Design an enzyme around this catalytic site. Sequence first.
Site, PDB file in Angstrom:
ATOM      1  N   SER A 144       0.855  -1.164   0.000  1.00 58.16           N
ATOM      2  CA  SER A 144       0.000   0.000   0.000  1.00 58.16           C
ATOM      3  C   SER A 144       0.900   1.225   0.000  1.00 58.16           C
ATOM      4  CB  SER A 144      -0.896  -0.012   1.243  1.00 58.16           C
ATOM      5  OG  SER A 144      -0.112  -0.256   2.402  1.00 58.16           O
ATOM      6  N   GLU A 156       1.693   6.938  12.175  1.00 55.55           N
ATOM      7  CA  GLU A 156       0.948   5.716  11.929  1.00 55.55           C
ATOM      8  C   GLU A 156       1.793   4.688  11.149  1.00 55.55           C
ATOM      9  OE1 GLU A 156      -2.348   4.946  12.892  1.00 55.55           O
ATOM     10  OE2 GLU A 156      -1.812   6.648  14.190  1.00 55.55           O
ATOM     11  N   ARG A 181     -10.107   2.939   6.032  1.00 60.54           N
ATOM     12  CA  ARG A 181      -9.818   4.324   6.401  1.00 60.54           C
ATOM     13  C   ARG A 181      -9.715   5.172   5.130  1.00 60.54           C
ATOM     14  NH1 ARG A 181      -5.468   4.052  11.381  1.00 60.54           N
ATOM     15  NH2 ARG A 181      -6.850   2.906  12.827  1.00 60.54           N
ATOM     16  N   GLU A 186      -5.207   5.833  -0.403  1.00 62.08           N
ATOM     17  CA  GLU A 186      -4.404   4.664  -0.714  1.00 62.08           C
ATOM     18  C   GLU A 186      -4.325   4.224  -2.174  1.00 62.08           C
ATOM     19  OE1 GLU A 186      -4.728   1.546   2.321  1.00 62.08           O
ATOM     20  OE2 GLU A 186      -4.296   0.060   0.760  1.00 62.08           O
TER      21      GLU A 186
END
Length: 223
Positions: A144, A156, A181, A186
Site C-alpha cells: 500500500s 501511523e 480508512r 491509498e
Amino acid sequence: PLMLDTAPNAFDDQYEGCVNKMEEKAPLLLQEDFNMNAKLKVAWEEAKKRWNNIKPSRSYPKGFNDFHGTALVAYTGSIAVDFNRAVREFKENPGQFHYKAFHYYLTRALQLLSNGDCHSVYRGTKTRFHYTGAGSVRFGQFTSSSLSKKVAQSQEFFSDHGTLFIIKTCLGVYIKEFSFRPDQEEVLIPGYEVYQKVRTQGYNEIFLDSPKRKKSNYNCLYS
C-alpha cells in the site's frame, strides 16, 4: 533492516493465460485456504459484510465480482500483514501457502481496476530498508502507498527507524473506495511491478522510478 531487491523468492503470479480457469477453480481453492487459515477466514467473513455495503455505491469493471471486491476490502484490513509475509517468504517453502485463492482474487481485482494511469506515491515504514544493488527493485508482496506524503510520514506508518519510499508507479490502483480508512488516499501496488531506477538518499529515503511491467517468476502456479 530488510533487503530491497528483485524479490526473487516472492510469489508473484500475474495469471497470464489462466484467468478463465482460475475464476472457475478459485472458489474451491478459497475453501481450502480457509480450512487451513483461520485468520484469513475470519478476516474474509468480515470483509464480505463491508463489501455488501460498499458495492451498491458504484459500478465496477466487467468481470469484477464479489470475490474481487471482498479480497480488496480484506487487504486494507488486518489480514494484510500475514498475507504479505506469506507471499514474501513463499519460495522458502511453498507447501504451506494458504492464500492460493486470496492472492489470485486480489491480483485480478487490481488488474481489472487498472488503467494507464501512473501515480506519484509515498510509503512510510518503521523498518529500515537496504537496497542491495541488484540493478532494479520489485516489492514482491502487494504494497500500500498514499498519494499524500503527509499520510505516509505520519506516526501511523513511519519512524526515524524506518524508510520513506518516493515511488512512481504505473500499475498501482487508487482504491479509496475499498479502504477501511478513507482519508489515506491509498494506492495499492502489485508486487510484480519493476522499478528500473533506484536511488537511496540519506539514511531513510528511497526513490523508485522508471516503473515497468515484466514477466514474473511464477505464472498460473495453482491453475
